[PDB]
């Protein structure tokens, strides 16, 4: 068992080693791909980011100073690793380092304690004034001293002063403002801003807010009140001008009172020193503070100058205030127009629409929520370049980031949308409520944990199977091609029938093909591990996975190899079939979430899908910081993924299923590869081979293939078997061997049945089929070694058998060369010798001389002479002339039944015609007849043709005395008879064999009409093929049109409603601080009610919230540590050095116990989170929520989006109440101005001081991944505030605010973008119609190629067919074939009503484009027919090249034209649109331009278009059409020029031809010379021949003689280098058409069409030869009648027998009556009845008066059919004469055979040598003798004849036979030597 196993393994290894190029490329193919992958990975290393925190952001509702402070400081959004002060529950602002806050606090704390001083001063002044109609001075002095001392202890004043006295260097004003915080003057400010890029970008972001223009469409007084309430903040802001002008008016007055009022001031100051002196050092320090004698110090002048400078700076800052940025518009359309006009000068900011519920103008929305007032709806319109897009909510590809980038994602902040929303909401709540609520809103972004960003892992998981499949496609194709090639040549059948079993072959193939896959897998695992692609993973698991996949793919390849039956077809189709199974993985991964878990296992049946699922599981497990390892082989990383063990099990199950399916399907072909006149009494009775009434019945044929055969064979005799094809000979051979079991009868061989003995009869059996059994890569030595080893011979003595056989076959010199496919013809003798290696007693041969050269034929025959002893041999060969030489006994079968059998002596050849007496001439028939009758009455006259006379001598009464007297008289008369020659031949076995077989301008118009009919019939006969190759390509795109519009077309962004409920179920916060206030409780209750919670009764409300239970281990961990509700969580690990993780993972004890929660009616979850950080909790608990959606990473649904914290008051001491008291005391008492110039200012200062309480605040935590969370939560907060402030009642339910979002429709550049720069559906349609239409043009070359490889085209050309007409007809038929799919696709476009292809202006463009596309694309495929030799591979290559060039050119030019950045891309595409040439690229450009222009017309016709945009314009599609139509005929011209690129008797006949030419002689040859290139010797050199037309000429020769060269030169196949060959007086060189018009050519090649029938060919030829239409039918009838064809009339010519092909070729040649008919090898292995019809037809045609020249190997026919023969060797004639003279001249002597029952040589040889002087002998055997009498005997043969008549009495002789020098005497001479 093992022996054949490793023999097969060694044979496969020998195959593999002999093709180094394939092995090297197979090894090196995936290495480059994985090197590319490794380089790609090396390009982008992973990134790491630490834990991140963000600062707070205020809003204008909170205040003015904090809002601007935030706007200025938090421009940059720097991430903070530590905690920020704003997130703690207590603090709100984080700007104590800010100078402004310190200044405000200092001012408040100083003015708080100064009330007593100012009040005392005021009351003193008033009492002094009242008494007008010293102690107050002292009190005022002390108060001023105290205030001066207090203001001295204020550093912030010192820093601000030091800031003021500085030059104007550095950068500009805003940098100084930022340092202090964190109109030509305006023109200079803008210039300074543009001076520095930082200030440049700051001003770019800030300017639209400053210089905007707010608008509102409705103009009712309600909206006017709303707008006034809106800009109340702007009204308050523009107050600095009032104080500026107040200072500007007051300063001059006090200044005038300051200087030149010096005497008076000195007077009071001198008065006030002695006031304190006589009542200390504190006073003069106060005096120095006043600086009354101020020269060294600086108080007054500098204070005045600095106050003026600061006021001027503030005025300059406020100079460019917008002042009035609020306008109104009457209508929405007018609003849009005015907004666009403002956008023209960069003035527009945002438009507001107060859409009312009563208006009912709501697209896709309810007109109103309910009847009655109290509902307000607001739209905000802004430029699309600012507001975020409004088409999708969540990102389509999850990223592991916090999404904090102010330029890209944070658009609502620097666009000002939130500011306007907050202002409008505050105005609306103020107007609706009727009160003045206060709530400072703050925005806080939730923190994000430390993470690692790596884009490579997801694409790796999505792309690894693709790389593996493209890596192993080559190996799959090679394996399937090798298997199919082996199974095609039936060698597997020989191995199975010769002793092997199916299991051994399958295991050998498996273990042969499992090597390279495992080697590649090992190399890939090594490069993956060492390439850092999959780090931290143990290689063993990956290697096992890859090995399982390799096993699955190799068994899948074996399964795939069970469909095809052609080598190259299988090689081409296997790769496509295997790659086509990978798409379902892509389809599944696209719809990953949709598919249920039930279908996953079902889809995993295909190997690539299972591998992809395993790969994604491996990648997901890799991302968790630990690759594949033994720790977690059987653990599922996620709830809905597969562990690797399940994947491996599924792979092995699939492999087993595929193997079993292949084993079952191997039986799809059962078996198919897709009269008693006898004698049994030999002298040696050795029944070695015997069959007794065998029976078998094939399923296809109801009649049994072979009937009962009771004949038995005998050892020691070379028995011969004769029969017809399909007459049971093949069935008998199959049954005798092990191919099929014996169905009936007995087949006992050597006493044991073949079926009973099984393998025990193999050691002594010999089978040699007609098909060769050889291996191309091996050589003869290992061939015989392998065969001897497999047959069971011991390897010890295999060497002697090997060398003995190789020396016996005479291949000693040719075995050391070690070449198999480098030799031809010789291999037959080696193949037949292989059957003799085992020394089997019984050997079977089937056609051992099928096509071998005669010069070696005797060779193999000699081998049979070497093994004619001690062995039984049974040969079954169709021919007869070889059978007689080796025939000890002969058996005959006919119709699956034995007819006769016996021995070739008279016991079998019972024929009346005994001997044939031939008389030749160089006189008179009556005289010869009278002489013959006188000598012997017995004589028959059968032949009387001129120059010969054949008589028949009856066998009965063969009295040799009378014949001897007759021939002696002839010897005494032949001298004067002028005959000078005669002969007596015996009965040829052919005639007796047959007898016993039946004993038991209009011309070319009709030519092209015929060609069109032929093409139409050929196309129509393949019904399924034509439908498949026409209907399918059109309907593919036809049905793909409707399904290609998945991608939505671009359009206006829809109006979106903003609300938290639009996301779904989620988790929110309502954390609260300082609950000691009824208003805060009311606000919290309003928030709870708005969240969707119902107020329960108090008894149930007591337990309205429930705390989830804590696990025991978590509680134990918390208790073990020291954890408080505020204290930090236990811990949480991070990314270790090297061991990176996507997200931190730490135990559930982190974050504390689960907080109490409740569930609302809408599925929302609310959580009560007071008493914590509320920050560390979020950081710890974030990844747990997201981990669920991490499996697919496509549309991740987070739970936490936002939350509220009710921060109340602010820890600090502003004490603004006493500030208001001081301000009102100053206003009422000091300087009461009735005009209000100061009174209104003091009023607003009092209002600000009293409003400084800031009763409460509210912080909103938002998650930025949700795109519209910010505005939704702001709206919810505003609605909750209004609900809280509203009184209880029904109106609470009926009052609400709705905020929407609706960007302005479009501008021009957005049109340019969204009209064509997407074009996804249009591009897909264009490329799809590019691919689908490309298959048709390559389909036409199949027919041309298959006619070119066959000699059918050549046979057609030897008619009257000109190449021009042929090519034109092919082109026209291709037009007719192509016309249908174009109509189908155009009707499809009409059916789907595509807008771009339905208008009256664009339809002709498409029609002409498609039609002319086909017209100009068909001729390009024609030139490819010549080079290629295989149809399917040529079709595949042409289709691939067409698709490649088309898609590459089109997509390259497309991607170049869009996304243009630099002028270099502009020029190149222009050239890429000028080079043209390719019709594929032309069609692509035309269609894509059509669709682009239609799209731009559709976009522009919505607006004012004013452009015709004609599709038919010259510069649009016209140039392509013109260029391609004018180049169309160029391909036809080039291909036609490529096709037409080609531009002693021997001596006496030579002299006769040289001296002149005969007019009657049709064939005249002069200087016949053919010189071969590179062979150093011409094939034929200087011959000549003159063939008369009234007789039939025959030419003969050995291989290499050059006869085929002569035939091809006469035909015209070979270029006529030199020589004259003229037929019928018409020269081939002068006019080849005239020579070929009347030539009837019949080659050995079966140039036939499978679909076409014989009668179709005959009718086609007849109508090509000018036969009238009516006479064509009768000509076809006569042509079939002269060959029969009654049973084959309707059958196609392809499905005929072997001889029927040649007979129909002869019929085709003879039809039309050509001047000369040439036949090359017309009789090669057919039934003798076909030969009978053939010689009948040829005698008829030669009698008709036409010349026929025939050349073949069997010349006996020519002896029996023609009257002139010529032998030629190596281009030199040898005989060239009349056939009888040829035998008389060179064939020389005569031979004699004797058959003696005693089988003793001497008694016969004595008088045989006595009769003639010669003593030549050959093959001296008892069965048959051969004696060569002296050649050229002058006397008659009668000298023996009568003598023989006596010697029958001397010795017992069975019979004597004489061979009187026939034509095959040359073959006898060759056999002898
Ligand atoms: C809320 O939880 C946070 C922790 O999530 C508490 O703040 C943390 O306080 C510790 C104690 O100082 C900080 O540890 C420090 O780490 C630095 C790192 O270099 C180290 O140099 C110091 O010696 C110290 O060990 C920790 O950084 C800090 N957390 C953050 C994010 O900065 C906070 O106290 C909790 N709130 C409470 C208790 O009210
Ligand atoms: C931006 O898009 C809006 C919305 O499509 C455009 O408003 C639309 O303008 C057209 C005028 O070109 C209006 O068509 C009119 O319809 C009435 C019937 O309601 C008909 O009687 C008129 O004869 C005219 O056909 C259309 O109603 C109006 N609205 C919609 C929803 O289509 C707007 O014009 C676009 N921007 C610009 C600058 O055009
Ligand atoms: C707020 O809006 C109102 C009306 O829309 C403005 O009232 C007028 O504003 C212009 C220029 O701003 C003044 O010239 C008029 O005298 C104002 N008339 C009245 C009756 O007030 C108001 O000015 C706007 N507020 C601001 C700061 O511009
Ligand atoms: C606050 O200052 C304003 C001046 O800017 C005082 O006068 C008001 O001015 C606006 C327009 O600027 C008018 O529409 C109002 O009618 C004016 N009077 C009032 C009472 O608002 C305003 O009086 C000052 N505030 C207080 C409380 O006196
Ligand atoms: C903004 O922050 C980035 C990143 O830290 C820094 O490089 C840049 O200088 C900052 N720019 C400004 C204007 O603050
Ligand atoms: C004030 O008056 C004095 C008187 O000599 C004069 O010199 C001075 O220029 C005036 N202005 C100021 C600002 O001192």
Tab-separated table of N, CA, C and O in Angstrom, residues 1495-1530:
chain	number	residue	atom	x	y	z
A	1495	UNK	N	-26.589	67.236	-15.075
A	1495	UNK	CA	-26.693	67.562	-13.657
A	1495	UNK	C	-26.559	69.061	-13.419
A	1495	UNK	O	-27.309	69.641	-12.623
A	1496	UNK	N	-25.609	69.710	-14.099
A	1496	UNK	CA	-25.437	71.147	-13.909
A	1496	UNK	C	-26.615	71.922	-14.485
A	1496	UNK	O	-26.995	72.971	-13.953
A	1497	UNK	N	-27.209	71.422	-15.573
A	1497	UNK	CA	-28.418	72.046	-16.102
A	1497	UNK	C	-29.576	71.917	-15.120
A	1497	UNK	O	-30.326	72.876	-14.904
A	1498	UNK	N	-29.736	70.738	-14.515
A	1498	UNK	CA	-30.797	70.540	-13.532
A	1498	UNK	C	-30.602	71.446	-12.323
A	1498	UNK	O	-31.561	72.034	-11.811
A	1499	UNK	N	-29.363	71.555	-11.840
A	1499	UNK	CA	-29.089	72.444	-10.716
A	1499	UNK	C	-29.332	73.902	-11.083
A	1499	UNK	O	-29.894	74.659	-10.283
A	1500	UNK	N	-28.917	74.313	-12.281
A	1500	UNK	CA	-29.048	75.697	-12.711
A	1500	UNK	C	-30.454	76.064	-13.164
A	1500	UNK	O	-30.827	77.238	-13.067
A	1501	UNK	N	-31.239	75.105	-13.663
A	1501	UNK	CA	-32.595	75.427	-14.093
A	1501	UNK	C	-33.513	75.715	-12.913
A	1501	UNK	O	-34.539	76.385	-13.080
A	1502	UNK	N	-33.171	75.215	-11.722
A	1502	UNK	CA	-33.894	75.617	-10.521
A	1502	UNK	C	-33.747	77.114	-10.282
A	1502	UNK	O	-34.719	77.798	-9.940
A	1503	UNK	N	-32.538	77.633	-10.455
A	1503	UNK	CA	-32.272	79.063	-10.429
A	1503	UNK	C	-32.374	79.601	-11.859
A	1503	UNK	O	-32.916	78.937	-12.746
A	1504	UNK	N	-31.884	80.815	-12.096
A	1504	UNK	CA	-31.791	81.349	-13.450
A	1504	UNK	C	-30.640	80.655	-14.169
A	1504	UNK	O	-29.472	80.843	-13.810
A	1505	UNK	N	-30.961	79.851	-15.182
A	1505	UNK	CA	-29.945	79.096	-15.910
A	1505	UNK	C	-29.419	79.877	-17.111
A	1505	UNK	O	-28.222	80.175	-17.189
A	1506	UNK	N	-30.304	80.213	-18.048
A	1506	UNK	CA	-29.963	81.001	-19.234
A	1506	UNK	C	-28.814	80.368	-20.015
A	1506	UNK	O	-27.919	81.047	-20.523
A	1507	UNK	N	-28.846	79.040	-20.110
A	1507	UNK	CA	-27.824	78.293	-20.830
A	1507	UNK	C	-28.455	77.067	-21.471
A	1507	UNK	O	-29.054	76.241	-20.776
A	1508	UNK	N	-28.321	76.956	-22.794
A	1508	UNK	CA	-28.881	75.810	-23.504
A	1508	UNK	C	-28.174	74.518	-23.112
A	1508	UNK	O	-28.824	73.498	-22.854
A	1509	UNK	N	-26.844	74.550	-23.050
A	1509	UNK	CA	-26.019	73.384	-22.730
A	1509	UNK	C	-26.364	72.202	-23.638
A	1509	UNK	O	-26.835	71.152	-23.197
A	1510	UNK	N	-26.123	72.399	-24.928
A	1510	UNK	CA	-26.451	71.384	-25.921
A	1510	UNK	C	-25.503	70.199	-25.789
A	1510	UNK	O	-24.284	70.379	-25.890
A	1511	UNK	N	-26.010	68.984	-25.565
A	1511	UNK	CA	-25.114	67.819	-25.482
A	1511	UNK	C	-24.356	67.544	-26.768
A	1511	UNK	O	-23.295	66.908	-26.727
A	1512	UNK	N	-24.866	68.003	-27.909
A	1512	UNK	CA	-24.322	67.659	-29.217
A	1512	UNK	C	-23.269	68.660	-29.702
A	1512	UNK	O	-22.818	68.570	-30.850
A	1513	UNK	N	-22.848	69.590	-28.848
A	1513	UNK	CA	-21.871	70.597	-29.240
A	1513	UNK	C	-20.530	69.955	-29.591
A	1513	UNK	O	-20.180	68.879	-29.098
A	1514	UNK	N	-19.783	70.633	-30.469
A	1514	UNK	CA	-18.513	70.097	-30.954
A	1514	UNK	C	-17.517	69.889	-29.819
A	1514	UNK	O	-16.838	68.857	-29.761
A	1515	UNK	N	-17.409	70.859	-28.911
A	1515	UNK	CA	-16.399	70.797	-27.860
A	1515	UNK	C	-16.809	69.916	-26.689
A	1515	UNK	O	-16.002	69.721	-25.774
A	1516	UNK	N	-18.029	69.385	-26.689
A	1516	UNK	CA	-18.498	68.557	-25.585
A	1516	UNK	C	-18.238	67.088	-25.896
A	1516	UNK	O	-17.512	66.408	-25.162
A	1517	UNK	N	-18.827	66.589	-26.982
A	1517	UNK	CA	-18.700	65.182	-27.345
A	1517	UNK	C	-18.342	65.059	-28.822
A	1517	UNK	O	-18.007	63.972	-29.305
A	1518	UNK	N	-18.401	66.178	-29.548
A	1518	UNK	CA	-18.218	66.125	-30.991
A	1518	UNK	C	-16.835	65.661	-31.409
A	1518	UNK	O	-16.692	64.883	-32.357
A	1519	UNK	N	-15.797	66.137	-30.716
A	1519	UNK	CA	-14.430	65.787	-31.092
A	1519	UNK	C	-14.180	64.292	-30.943
A	1519	UNK	O	-13.558	63.666	-31.811
A	1520	UNK	N	-14.652	63.703	-29.841
A	1520	UNK	CA	-14.483	62.268	-29.644
A	1520	UNK	C	-15.168	61.486	-30.753
A	1520	UNK	O	-14.579	60.562	-31.330
A	1521	UNK	N	-16.409	61.859	-31.076
A	1521	UNK	CA	-17.152	61.176	-32.127
A	1521	UNK	C	-16.416	61.259	-33.456
A	1521	UNK	O	-16.228	60.244	-34.137
A	1522	UNK	N	-15.980	62.464	-33.835
A	1522	UNK	CA	-15.312	62.644	-35.121
A	1522	UNK	C	-14.013	61.849	-35.184
A	1522	UNK	O	-13.757	61.132	-36.162
A	1523	UNK	N	-13.181	61.955	-34.144
A	1523	UNK	CA	-11.906	61.250	-34.150
A	1523	UNK	C	-12.110	59.744	-34.224
A	1523	UNK	O	-11.433	59.055	-34.997
A	1524	UNK	N	-13.060	59.212	-33.453
A	1524	UNK	CA	-13.197	57.762	-33.413
A	1524	UNK	C	-13.858	57.234	-34.684
A	1524	UNK	O	-13.499	56.155	-35.167
A	1525	UNK	N	-14.793	57.989	-35.271
A	1525	UNK	CA	-15.394	57.533	-36.522
A	1525	UNK	C	-14.372	57.580	-37.650
A	1525	UNK	O	-14.364	56.710	-38.529
A	1526	UNK	N	-13.492	58.585	-37.651
A	1526	UNK	CA	-12.506	58.643	-38.723
A	1526	UNK	C	-11.406	57.605	-38.511
A	1526	UNK	O	-10.791	57.147	-39.480
A	1527	UNK	N	-11.138	57.206	-37.262
A	1527	UNK	CA	-10.156	56.150	-37.040
A	1527	UNK	C	-10.739	54.750	-37.198
A	1527	UNK	O	-9.966	53.797	-37.334
A	1528	UNK	N	-12.064	54.606	-37.172
A	1528	UNK	CA	-12.718	53.324	-37.321
A	1528	UNK	C	-12.165	52.437	-38.422
A	1528	UNK	O	-11.671	51.335	-38.165
A	1529	UNK	N	-12.239	52.897	-39.676
A	1529	UNK	CA	-11.721	52.083	-40.789
A	1529	UNK	C	-10.226	51.815	-40.721
A	1529	UNK	O	-9.750	50.905	-41.418
A	1530	UNK	N	-9.470	52.579	-39.928
A	1530	UNK	CA	-8.028	52.363	-39.854
A	1530	UNK	C	-7.702	50.998	-39.258
A	1530	UNK	O	-6.764	50.331	-39.707
